[PDB]
Each structure stands twice: as C-alpha cells, then as structure tokens.
Design a binder for this molecule. Sequence first.
Ligand SMILES: O=C(O)[C@@H]1CN(S(=O)(=O)c2ccc3cc(Cl)ccc3c2)CCN1CC1CCN(c2ccncc2)CC1
Ligand SMILES: [Ca+2]
Lengths: 235, 51
Amino acid sequence: IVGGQECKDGECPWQALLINEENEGFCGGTILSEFYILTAAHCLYQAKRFKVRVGDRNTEQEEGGEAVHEVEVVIKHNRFTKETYDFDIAVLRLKTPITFRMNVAPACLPERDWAESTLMTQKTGIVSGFGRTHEKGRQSTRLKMLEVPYVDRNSCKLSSSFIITQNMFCAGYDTKQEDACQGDSGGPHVTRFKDTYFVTGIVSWGEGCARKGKYGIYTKVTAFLKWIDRSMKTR
Amino acid sequence: KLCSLDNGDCDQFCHEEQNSVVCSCARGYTLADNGKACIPTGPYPCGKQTL
Ligand SMILES: O=C(O)[C@@H]1CN(S(=O)(=O)c2ccc3cc(Cl)ccc3c2)CCN1CC1CCN(c2ccncc2)CC1
Ligand SMILES: [Ca+2]
C-alpha cells in the first residue's frame, strides 16, 4: 500500500492474509463470515499450498490475537482467465470457524442495487493489505489502509491500457502516491456508510503502483454478489 | 418512497418498495421497532470495527 495510514486496533477487522508454506503472506482477503473468505481469483496461483491468517496487524511481533486457518475448499470462478483478468474473484471455505474477537470480525455483504446506488456513488472507499509500500520495495510489516476515491469509469477506461470490463472498477488517484501495490491482491475493498462497512471490491490488478495517470483496478463485488451466495451455500 | 432523499432514513439497505420506503439490514442485524434502525444480535456484527 503506497501511502495510506496504519490500521489501528480493531480498525480493519475484516482483513485477511494468505500465507504460503514458507509462512509468507502473499495475498489478501476479506472475512465474510466464520467459515468463508473472499479473495482474488488470481491469488490461487502464487503458491502450491497456502493458509489464511487473521487478526494480525504486524508481521514480525507476535501480538496475541493472531490465528491460522486451513482451506477446506477453494471456489475459483469459472470464467476467470489470466489473459484478461476478467472475473477476478474466488471464495475460500475454512475448516475451523474463525472466532470473532478483537481484530477479527467480518465485513457486511450489501444488496446489489442499494450498493451500486448508495455505496459506489459514495466519495471514497477503503483498501487495505500488507502489500509493498513502494513498487520496488519489500512487503510490509504492519497492516494498513488507504482511503481511495472512486474514479469515473470513463477516465478509468481512458487511463487504462487493458479492457476495463463490467466486472471491474477503478479507484484511486491520478497523481498522488497512494495506491495498493504488490501483495495486496485479493485484499478487501470496503465502502463506509453510517459507521458500518460493506464489501465492495477485491484488490485485482493495476499498472504499477500509484503511477501517474494510472489507477487501481478492483473487482466489482456487486457484480458477483449472487455468485458469492451460492458459493457460501457451497458449490 | 425516495431512498433517494436520505437513504430512506434507513440504517442500511433501502428499498422504494411500491409507493413507500422499506428499510432492511445485512445478516446479523434485525430491523428496529421503528422500521429504520438496524440492531446487532451477536457481539461481532459484520461491518463494525471491533473497538
Ligand atoms: O497487477 C498485476 O498483478 C501486476 C502487479 N504489479 S503489483 O505491484 O504486484 C500490483 C498488484 C495489484 C495491484 C492492485 C491495485 Cl488496485 C493497484 C496496484 C497494484 C499493483 C503491478 C503491475 N501488474 C501488471 C499487470 C499484468 C497483467 N494484467 C492484465 C493483462 C491483460 N489485461 C488486463 C490486465 C494485470 C496487471
Ligand atoms: Ca502479529
């Protein structure tokens, strides 16, 4: 996460981290409930066998409320494809149920129409992760959040170099040096409405980090809602 | 009706069902007696920062 702030105690409770076997956090995720996790459908490639950590805000100083969970099943999206990064979205079912305590709670899943209407028309949104803090840099130790404004879909499509489908949206800044970087994939994008957050995006891809004239591409979560349902009903 | 005004003055989901406004919440919540506010039912409701 280039720029942004630092997630304070129980401030980003829905964050999640997919750690490889060497115990390294490679991607992100979002807690939907005690058994299901929401991630990018393209993070199920950066490893062979991975786990999901929750409750960690600092990767190095064993706080206390951490907890590792094992993946029972992966639900990658049918239509997904690396060639165009369309349908970047998958859901993980954990074996042991996530126990909500401090720094561990789930994010709400909104209704589609109400969401696109009031959540995506909101001014900003929040993205968070343990991702790189400067394109060429080392990953991050602390967990962090960046309030990234929604971008006009046109500009988005103009500023891009790749077809910005209807299953994705832009968010971020044109010049500022603040924009999710490597390692934030699958991470959570939530919108805030009346002190209660709702999942709205999944860190997907981007041309570099915080680049001039380029934005941050997220997966339109509203465009997969129904999918997410029968995905938690298992399928 | 008019979830256009101020989200129907709801707490969360707002619906211009038929002629009037109809509020609703996410899972884990329940709509208050006033049909507008959303109240938790468990100690760890989605969307709330654990403070
Ligand atoms: O993104 C990639 O993994 C790689 C990722 N890296 S990143 O620092 O690891 C990174 C990762 C996720 C991000 C997320 C946000 Cl919201 C903002 C900045 C980010 C930056 C940047 C460049 N792309 C290239 C590109 C490699 C191939 N791609 C396409 C090819 C054909 N059509 C559409 C997309 C997507 C990203
Ligand atoms: Ca820790």
